[PDB]
Symmetry: D2
Subunit: 331 residues, 4 copies
Amino acid sequence: HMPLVALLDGRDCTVEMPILKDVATVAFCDAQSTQEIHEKVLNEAVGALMYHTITLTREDLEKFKALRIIVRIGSGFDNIDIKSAGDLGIAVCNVPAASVEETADSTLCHILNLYRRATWLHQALREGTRVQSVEQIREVASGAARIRGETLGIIGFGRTGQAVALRAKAFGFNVLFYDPYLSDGVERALGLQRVSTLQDLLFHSDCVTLHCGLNEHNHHLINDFTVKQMRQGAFLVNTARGGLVDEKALAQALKEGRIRGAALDVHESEPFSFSQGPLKDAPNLICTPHAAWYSEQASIEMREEAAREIRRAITGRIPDSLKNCVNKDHL
Amino acid sequence: HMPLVALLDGRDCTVEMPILKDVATVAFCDAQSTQEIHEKVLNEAVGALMYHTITLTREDLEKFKALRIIVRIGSGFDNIDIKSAGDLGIAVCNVPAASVEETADSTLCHILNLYRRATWLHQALREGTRVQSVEQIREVASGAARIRGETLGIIGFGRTGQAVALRAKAFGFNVLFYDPYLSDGVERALGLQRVSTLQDLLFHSDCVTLHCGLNEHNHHLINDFTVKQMRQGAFLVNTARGGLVDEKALAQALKEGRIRGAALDVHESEPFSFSQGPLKDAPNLICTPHAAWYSEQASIEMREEAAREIRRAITGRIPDSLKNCVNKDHL
Amino acid sequence: HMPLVALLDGRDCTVEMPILKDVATVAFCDAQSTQEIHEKVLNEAVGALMYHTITLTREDLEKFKALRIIVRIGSGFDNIDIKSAGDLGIAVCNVPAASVEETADSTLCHILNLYRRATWLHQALREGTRVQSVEQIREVASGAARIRGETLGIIGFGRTGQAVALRAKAFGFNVLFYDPYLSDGVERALGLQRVSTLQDLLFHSDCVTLHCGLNEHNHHLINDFTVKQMRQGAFLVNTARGGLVDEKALAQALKEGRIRGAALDVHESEPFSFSQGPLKDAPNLICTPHAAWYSEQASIEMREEAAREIRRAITGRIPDSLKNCVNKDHL
Amino acid sequence: HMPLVALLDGRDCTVEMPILKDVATVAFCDAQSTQEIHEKVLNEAVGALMYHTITLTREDLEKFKALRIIVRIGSGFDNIDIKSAGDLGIAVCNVPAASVEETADSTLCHILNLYRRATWLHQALREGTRVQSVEQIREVASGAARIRGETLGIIGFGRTGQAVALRAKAFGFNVLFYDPYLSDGVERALGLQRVSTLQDLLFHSDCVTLHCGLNEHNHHLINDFTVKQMRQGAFLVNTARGGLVDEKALAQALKEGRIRGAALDVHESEPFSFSQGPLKDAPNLICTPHAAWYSEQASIEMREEAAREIRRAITGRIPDSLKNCVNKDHL
Ligand SMILES: Nc1ncnc2c1ncn2[C@@H]1O[C@H](COP(=O)(O)O)[C@@H](O)[C@H]1O
Ligand SMILES: Nc1ncnc2c1ncn2[C@@H]1O[C@H](COP(=O)(O)O)[C@@H](O)[C@H]1O
Ligand SMILES: Nc1ncnc2c1ncn2[C@@H]1O[C@H](COP(=O)(O)O)[C@@H](O)[C@H]1O
Ligand SMILES: Nc1ncnc2c1ncn2[C@@H]1O[C@H](COP(=O)(O)O)[C@@H](O)[C@H]1O
Ligand SMILES: [Ca+2]
Ligand SMILES: [Ca+2]
Ligand SMILES: [Ca+2]
Ligand SMILES: [Ca+2]
């Protein structure tokens, strides 16, 4: 009788089971919350696989009586109290590399959608707008702007942020980044300008894109205060984490025109709806349902890697055998 | 009393008049056809400014009794019989450089919109789709594909085509082009692979993008025959000219899935409508109303350049003074 | 009995003969001048292969009594009177693509050799210089300069020039070019700045590199006059043609320090010697013996292509069958 | 009376003193070894500035009776026992960013010097070689190779390594790297392939370039064993640290042709001489006297930064105030 591993917030384990067949019994819960988890898993689950639709607090984690590893199928782990998980003796891991370029591609797509208004232009044709003269073109496409010379400010200069920068350079962007945790000179290897503070980044950027994890020190990084530091008519793009932005502040900025447009793949409350929330009636808003990460090859890659990480934890020694443990310090 | 210059298919001459004030009387016609042009212009117009919403055949041009220059405010001139215009002693000019990067940016936006489905994903949220689980994400975003390793086939390797290639390289595309008029070795300077025939390009390309003018030899370049030469599930993008594609052929390819998606800024009949035409009910279609060229700075640049070209023709010697005459041979 | 083809200024025909065996008798002359060509070739040679070490004037070409094609094994043809050759009914062809990237790589090597002084630094160690302290390093390497922010001015924006630009961009150069024959907007497709005149290019460039053919209108393009228009302490690089530079002017500029250094793969009189010529005692000079074009694969590629061009001329119709005829107008 | 700071292995403190004037007395020793340091500095020196020409062992550091900070004017600190320095309560710092791009430029210069033989070709002309025929060009330039398609293997994917990769991509290199300390996915952000082991890197690379620090685990990383794992006729470039290569092994590889050429800015014993050492008579060797880092702007930048770091240590709290302390763990 092998250890039990549970896919907490999902139903499909097809990609994982060929890797774990002779290692662990695999069950799933399709649970949005811990309340919806059968007590068989809580008391006996040795490992857990998990996406982004369930959050595990210290109280949620204290209900598990035998869990020793949690593997987030994906890069971000802000939905898990990793320090409490470490206190309780539970290793938390992630899969960081699978969707780096997918997300950067989705990001560039949203950046170009703002500067070129292709998505809004398509809606206008879906809604029946007639664009016959060169002069109706200019009106319907009003706001489309030349990209060369514009300044793109990247918050978070890690893997995805650097992929964004590389792509942005080819379109003629002047690319800056702000990352207060990187060592001196990372800007030089890649031929970019770096700034010391968020205020400087927002001050100089016509378009601000977010590419940092959500941690204890940057909740609502974009807030009513820091939004006033953004250039008039600036763009905001967020394919990182919804909790990084105060949507109430953003909603007002868009309504008053202080921000000309925003493209958001993530939101404070998901799933997102154009009928519920602070952006209920905000203008110049493009939204995708947390899909910037998804490609068929990326989805398979991350699930196979996560399954292997579970295998390494069961058959090996924690945390030495793990390749992407994110709470070694708290463990 | 100065020579008369007429903005044929438009109303706004504000950008042009400061340049032409002391050179020519400036009138406009706001005419979609030659039938709608007041006979005062036909008999006395010495020069003409024109966009893409009116076509001038040999018969249309023979109605002008004093015209000696036509300046297309824009790069393409397929809407003017340039060889007959030259026969009749009328120089035809264009403005090629103003929207090179704007169009390449719109093109990359449409390419990424197909590979990432951001525009379709936004529609699904506008239509009320609920995307709660990781598993509804995969379904709603089904078709989104990893770009690295994919092959982008560029038809037409001129200014816009080369800007497309440069940008595409940064996303990991394998970029080929087909241009049967360029000299030997242009592929080498830019680090790209070139193919000899359209069939080869379509054979190897997962995504085909068009960046050639519409001339007498490539009407319906993409037709029922050449569409069968495209890879199964390939992408098509067209920000060049609508006449290059047989939409009846494309409509069927999209319906049967031989082409997974198409992004079109231009169409056989403009203005485009999702309710009229061969693509009335075609799936996986993204459309923009011939706006890939438009930025505020590009629109001003092209109009000022065209006004200067008109000035050079009136005050100087034709065709020696013109900087962008496109029918010197037929003149 | 087949037509005779002669390798005029060489001995080795090994690469060409498998292609021409059943098409033409192949002889060689190893001749630096026409005076050294056996009269059998002059009177009967139907085709000719040729490198850069022999020049054919109208008088040289009038000695051939049956020649109908000349194929330059290489890109440049300034050593052939192509217009007189056309008058006499002789097609002249070249092979332009084989060494585009080789030359751009040699160019970047010479550019970096000037900015980094690696070649001069190696000489100093060959001559026995002792570099022990950080302070002898600065002295021996005195002149080495930071590249980011420097301006590279490209004269000639064709295949090699554009390959130079692409590479130069990655090192942080600000790249301009001057090419008075290209159409409007070529700078935009590639994300570069263009200037109208040679004076402007030389005015703004810290390092000037030449990548244009030698034609009737740019002999001694760099002369005593235009050298005074160069920035103080500027760099000059020439991998194009020696006839483009007045070496007497350059020698003085280097001696007086108006030019800090020059890297030359070509020269007014070849073969080059550090003991003969106007640069006999010029300082800060790096020289290579007209080898910027050479790689093993490039040398084979060009010779096979040239052999095929000869084959096409003998077995087909001139000039219709030729792929790289450079005097179709004069023919 | 202020604290004393000593430039140990140098004489020039001009750039540093305006920053330290009112903070510390500044003396210099111009010492290649600790034996040559006046005892006034040993007993009273509170801080130390230092380049790469003196090494400080535990025994050297134990002679200082009041030293509390050492600042290496430069990136590498392999010449300082940092762990013993930390044991003795001495913070060790460096200046990492000043010469990132200078070194990458020197590296690319040496890489191109090998592939293009420009430096060797210039020597041949200095030695009087006559290169008249196309056929003497091929012989004298024999070995010059086409770069597109070649594989560049980077050992060490930090700041300089990544700058090397970016530049190398533009020349057509296929760039791999090996860095066993970086997290999963760094290769993806930058569009490169990564390998797990040194053997794999050496196996696939036509040209191997070193860009890692010298630490306790990679002395003689390139040794007689690992040299046999290099591809036949491969290139080696080293602008990092001389101690990374067994020159006896390299000397033999070059003599037998297993390595076609090597470009070395650093060496096991410096200063380097072509008359002393294991490479006394090694062929196909290019050498520079540890100058890859030097530009005028880089030299000033690093000295001002180091002076500021000394100022921060004297006027602030160690190690909290330091911006580039490299032994916080051992302190
Ligand atoms: N508040 C913040 N502001 C800017 N950058 C941040 C912040 N928090 C984290 N980061 C950076 O975001 C990056 C995440 O990269 P990755 O997780 O590899 O995509 C890291 O370089 C972090 O240092
Ligand atoms: N039928 C065709 N197929 C491929 N390329 C074409 C065709 N017709 C024209 N072109 C090319 O399209 C390019 C137009 O570039 P531009 O007008 O500068 O954007 C030129 O390089 C033409 O040679
Ligand atoms: N005097 C000149 N100044 C600047 N560019 C020139 C000059 N003469 C020729 N060229 C350009 O040099 C380029 C040669 O390119 P290629 O022969 O393809 O390497 C062409 O673009 C020419 O227009
Ligand atoms: N033995 C080694 N093999 C490969 N990479 C190494 C080795 N030792 C250190 N490195 C890497 O070298 C890089 C140094 O970068 P930097 O000091 O920023 O130029 C870091 O990424 C290290 O992980
Ligand atoms: Ca703006
Ligand atoms: Ca596909
Ligand atoms: Ca200078
Ligand atoms: Ca080789």
